[PDB]
């Protein structure tokens, strides 16, 4: 077998969508 | 299992789906928006800083609103934000004294007020604070129209607002009947609150009433399939003629 690729996180800025219900409130604060 | 959305979001999902979405946008905005009633029995902290216990340093502060009970009779009357305060009291305003179960009653009254827009005098439950507001509002009609629902604190007052708004919106001759010249003055006097007829209808409507009203608006008798096929057949034949 060949080992699975090492996990890689998504890089760069990610802006949460305010309208989305799932996104938490703290991610929408001006401090964020 | 575990619900993807918390229980509080269930209400949000219901509002966002079904006939609730089909409700008029103007009415939906009125329901969605929340305006805090004017404080009457409690005051927010004047200063924004206080001494934290654990660190003994100045810290930001929070406000604890006093519990005030507004009975449904207020919704059937015109109360100026006054309400029943239910709770415990310390006799003589010292903590060292006994604790007594106390119900604090604002002085309640039933009084008659004249409405220029409705051209009728209405006898309703009212408080002294409302009467001062009416004078400050430059008329009883102004107070109903100017005051928001929460500050008004009256379903009947909101219902009165609904009637007044519709009366202004339609320029209905029902205002001051037999006096068209006087009718124009009232409309001009309260011209500021003239709004679209559709919005005025839904002002102050209860959720159950709104849902039934929307259902009645969208309910339509079954189409006889003979007629439907007639229209379809003609359209195809008309297209064929082209």
């Amino acid at each position: 077998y060949r080992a699975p690729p090492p996990p890689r996180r998504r890089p760069g800025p990610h802006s949460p969508d305010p309208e989305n219900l799932l996104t938490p409130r703290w991610q929408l604060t001006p401090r964020y | 299992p575990l619900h993807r959305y918390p229980v509080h979001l269930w209400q949000k999902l219901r509002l966002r789906q079904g006939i609730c979405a089909r409700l008029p946008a103007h009415f939906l905005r009125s329901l969605e928006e929340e305006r805090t009633p004017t404080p009457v029995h409690y005051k927010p902290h004047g200063t924004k800083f206080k001494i934290n216990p654990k660190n003994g340093q100045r810290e930001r502060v929070e406000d604890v609103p006093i519990p005030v009970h507004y009975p449904p009779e207020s919704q059937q009357g015109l109360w100026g934000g006054e309400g029943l305060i239910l709770g415990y009291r310390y006799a003589n305003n010292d903590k060292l004294s006994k604790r007594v179960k106390k119900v604090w009653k604002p002085q309640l009254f039933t009084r008659e007020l004249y409405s220029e827009i409705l051209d009728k005098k209405f006898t309703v439950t009212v408080t002294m604070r409302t009467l001062d507001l009416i004078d400050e509002a430059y008329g009883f009609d102004f107070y109903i129209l100017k005051t928001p629902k929460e500050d008004l604190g009256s379903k009947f007052g909101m219902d009165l607002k609904r009637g007044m708004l519709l009366r202004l919106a339609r320029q209905d001759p029902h205002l001051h009947p037999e006096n068209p010249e006087r009718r124009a003055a009232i409309y001009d006097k309260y011209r500021s609150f003239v709004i679209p007829e559709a919005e005025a209808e839904w002002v102050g409507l209860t959720l159950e009433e709104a849902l039934e009203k929307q259902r009645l608006l969208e309910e339509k008798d079954p189409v006889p399939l003979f007629k439907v096929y007639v229209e379809e057949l003609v359209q195809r034949l008309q297209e064929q003629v082209l």
Binding site: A3, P6 | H8
Partner: protein, 93 residues
């Protein structure tokens, strides 16, 4: 007691399957990955105990906080009653 009168069928197990063969791989992600991802981040399981461990009361209390709003009403009441017994046992005995 009495015992079986028949022998179970023989069973053969492969010890070099991918799961066993690759067990433990990437466990040095932090040291070999510049510590960008801690090995605790690789834990998959119940949300309230991912990268965290505690006594039974702590695990139960953390479970309530994590999924309390998403738990059933009957389960929440049962969990509240269960927490009471756990709290008294550890904190009073």
């Amino acid at each position: 007691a009495f015992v079986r009168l028949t022998l179970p069928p023989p069973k053969v197990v492969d010890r070099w399957n991918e799961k066993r063969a690759l067990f433990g791989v990437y466990d040095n992600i932090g040291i070999l990955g510049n510590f960008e991802k801690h090995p605790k981040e690789l834990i998959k399981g119940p949300v309230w105990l991912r990268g965290w461990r505690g006594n039974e009361l702590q695990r139960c209390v953390r479970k309530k906080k994590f999924v309390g709003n998403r738990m059933f009403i009957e389960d929440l009441h049962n969990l509240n009653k269960r927490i009471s017994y756990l709290y008294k046992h550890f904190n009073r005995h």
